[PDB]
Amino acid sequence: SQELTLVGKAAVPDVEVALDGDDWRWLARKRVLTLGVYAPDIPPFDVTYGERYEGLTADYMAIIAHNLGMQAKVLRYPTREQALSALESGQIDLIGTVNGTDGRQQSLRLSVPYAADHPVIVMPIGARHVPASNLAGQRLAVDINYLPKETLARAYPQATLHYFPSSEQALAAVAYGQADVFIGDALTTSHLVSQSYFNDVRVVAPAHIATGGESFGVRADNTRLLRVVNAVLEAIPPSEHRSLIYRWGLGSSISLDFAHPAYSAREQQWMADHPVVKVAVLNLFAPFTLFRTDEQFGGISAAVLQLLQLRTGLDFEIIGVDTVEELIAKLRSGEADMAGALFVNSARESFLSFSRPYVRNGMVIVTRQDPDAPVDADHLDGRTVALVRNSAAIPLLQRRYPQAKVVTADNPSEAMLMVANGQADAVVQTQISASYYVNRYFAGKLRIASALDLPPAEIALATTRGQTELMSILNKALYSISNDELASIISRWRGSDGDPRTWYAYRNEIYLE
Amino acid sequence: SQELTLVGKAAVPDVEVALDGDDWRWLARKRVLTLGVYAPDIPPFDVTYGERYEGLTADYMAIIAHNLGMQAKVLRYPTREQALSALESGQIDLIGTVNGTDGRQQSLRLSVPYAADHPVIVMPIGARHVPASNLAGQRLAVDINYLPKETLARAYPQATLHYFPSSEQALAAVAYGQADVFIGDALTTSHLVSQSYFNDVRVVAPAHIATGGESFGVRADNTRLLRVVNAVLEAIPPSEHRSLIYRWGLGSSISLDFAHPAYSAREQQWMADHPVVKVAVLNLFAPFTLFRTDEQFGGISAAVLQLLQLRTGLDFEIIGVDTVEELIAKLRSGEADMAGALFVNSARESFLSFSRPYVRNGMVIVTRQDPDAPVDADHLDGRTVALVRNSAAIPLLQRRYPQAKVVTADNPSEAMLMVANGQADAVVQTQISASYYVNRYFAGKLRIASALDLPPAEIALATTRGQTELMSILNKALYSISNDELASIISRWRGSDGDPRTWYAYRNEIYLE
């Protein structure tokens, strides 16, 4: 048994609480409300530093203590089973961070969940669709602390269970090939994946295992305490439930109230008749559409398409082409049902329909890092400037900067290589794309001279205009995707500027021996 | 005049609204509340795609319409004044997204702002402080549309103003060397920066110019409608204001509150006596502490210290050393006041004191990509595993993996290279750091084998056990840093798995011809 002091957010909200005048005076004499917490310490619920207790459970404990005029105390127990006994004594009035599988005890009763929480199914980036076959033949990794061994076994009997000390270890397994699937807590998964594993795994569906959200547990006879705690929790508005979830960085898990878009008669029967949708993408349009060292589809678009898959349940199959002219070709003929990423273009709006854009970004001209390179975009007079053939930018550019000499290339990658080779003085790119390339691969060879005085580029999904049922389905889904998820996705694709030259250097010395 | 459909978003809130009942049935008879919005379209407040209207303003219109039992309609007008003309006309009941410089118009009445927004000053990432002498002689970039020229000139009279078509072009100007300082509103600035400009610039302080938040405008004549709207707007809790801010990806702007940490007198005078604090960091500890191509301090930690400055007003001076021994050497000797990033360590807690961790990450083993390489950490029997000399990790590892043969190196970069060279069969790393190096610089040479069944590593600030006021201040600051901002920093530092072997390939082919 260890005592801790509760820090849980600076400004704790006031909820409208309605209690029996007899309930209030009971609380008044009780003085101290004691929460008990336990062994592993599983973020974001439980976070321990020094003598201080904090976390999502801490925060609701804070909300309960504050709105009931109570002094909060915290004791921390070496194991979950010792904590359960601490409740019985009852040395402590509340136990923290318990779900549906701990009461499930009958010795203990659960408060209304203070945190919405359900189990989710995680698979590697490549994996397509849920094994709706109830994960048969799969190696299913789980936190030993999350679900009871036989809840899984009953729900996934043809799956091979493999238990790990922690949620992270289970998830690591799926990332690094020791397991095929992960089942885990939605909140903690969201944390783990967003922080640093989003390249390795993805949340693919909810699991058909019922757990309660996260709750406080109160000893079974203590029917009065359950009343007054629930009095508070029920009064917490959803805005506060949400606000706290964003703060612990679990913004990715809001979406996990999963199926959300309401679909038409005409739309969902289309979805039955077209379970697989064919997407055309550019092979070298980084960081928007690309293929990794894995031969795997990747980039901002690949990330968004994956979410669209979560929202619609469609299975996207990706077809990669080298040039833009080819991409449109496959779109017209129906070889491809949709474009993964196209700049919104009024010219092609003749025959194409664009989704709600999911990237809006400004443009820049990239030059070599020679003394002779155009110093900035206002000094483009008589210099050769690379653009992609038939770009919406091309008319606009020679309108704004007429002394600039436009030369065209087939795809965005060749346009940039022209500048790297000496065949051009500048190339027009989105800031995201240019920023990316310059610091990542061309440190000390290329540079962003300046912005262009053009309107911002918009990147979207595209279909042929006839494709009406698809586009309304995509747009419905795209609307369900918040700009926070898009920003999280984009910024983590742009990344940060490190020191690739020191490490090009190390890879090169090693190659000599 | 074109009408738009307010896109039905998420879960629109119920606020506790109090109205007269002469008011309530007046609303019942009225049926429809009509919002007017106008051509320019200002993300994230006003966004148009086709016939659909969305944005921060859209969301609050919804809250007002919903909580007052109204069907909301939106008409979109080609010029601001055409909307103004519709307002007097009574075609529209309220006009959207008007702020403090339009309640300097007095011709219409403004609701209490539904979204707080203030101007901020943006400078290049390297900057320390706003330039002295009210930005005199500096090149100040602003959106032509943000502030009225005479407002800037009154406040920054000695400054060279440079106006731009857009907020992004202004910010682009500071990023790419054409301007020195940027001014714009916290909400749209936070989006631009957090989305893709965080490598190039930073928000440094608020600008001493008052603008109102964003408000609705209603006909001056219509005092009844002003009452009922404000009835709703006032009742929207701070959680809901925040949640919407988070959803639109502007979580970064809550940090521009600005200051929240309350400091003691003993502390406030310590900060006085030591305005400059010297931080020791490892030179090649990516993505935590490193020096990038600029010879500039970079990594997760630098971002975090950047935040620590903003929260405390200390000036951090960065001292880069090559090894851990060397680092601690400077920490004991007093050359350095604190460590930028150290693993939390039970051994050193005798003479070292650790901060609240700001990275918590589980550990992994990296092996070469030979068939000989260990398959996972359970198959390390008789294999050599590189760790850093006197690392807290070593004991824990040989306790768990007793047949494993530890070999040590001076720093983390050297420890990893041991595996690259052939001097070790595997190396111990944080999963983040390993993930980074492997996919970024060592594609097809190194790989992550599996997680380790050890506790997660914790990265923290460190001082000598004596430096108490320093540590106390750092911890106060670190608690004020939301777990959401830390997550945003870590993900953009891990970044994403691309195709480095392609661009190694293009770069060498360019130099060969």
Numbering used by the authors:
A (entry chain B), B (entry chain A): 33 to 545
Paper lines:
The virulence regulon of the whooping cough agent Bordetella pertussis is controlled by the two-component system BvgAS. The sensor-kinase BvgS harbor extra-cytoplasmic Venus flytrap perception domains similar to those found in neuronal receptors, and it is the prototype of a large bacterial protein family. The periplasmic moiety of BvgS is composed of two VFT domains, membrane-distal VFT1 and membrane-proximal VFT2.
The periplasmic domain of BvgS (residues Ala29-Leu544, which includes VFT1 and VFT2) was produced in Escherichia coli and crystallized as a recombinant protein with a 60-residue-long GB1 domain at the N terminus and a 6-His tag at the C terminus. BvgS forms intricate butterfly-shaped dimers in which the A and B polypeptide chains (‘protomers’) wind around each other, with an extensive dimeric interface of ≈ 4000 Å2. VFT1 and VFT2 adopt typical Venus flytrap architectures consisting of two α/β subdomains called lobes 1 and 2 (hereafter L1 and L2) separated by a cleft. The hinge is formed of anti-parallel β strands in VFT2 and flexible loops in VFT1. The two VFT1s are open, while atypically the VFT2s are closed with no ligand in their inter-lobe cavities, consistent with the structure of VFT2 alone. Both lobes of the VFT1s, VFT1L1 and VFT1L2, contact the hinge and lobes of VFT2 of the opposite protomer, forming the largest dimeric interfaces. Thus, the kinase-on state of BvgS depends on tight connections between the periplasmic domains and the transmembrane H19 helices.
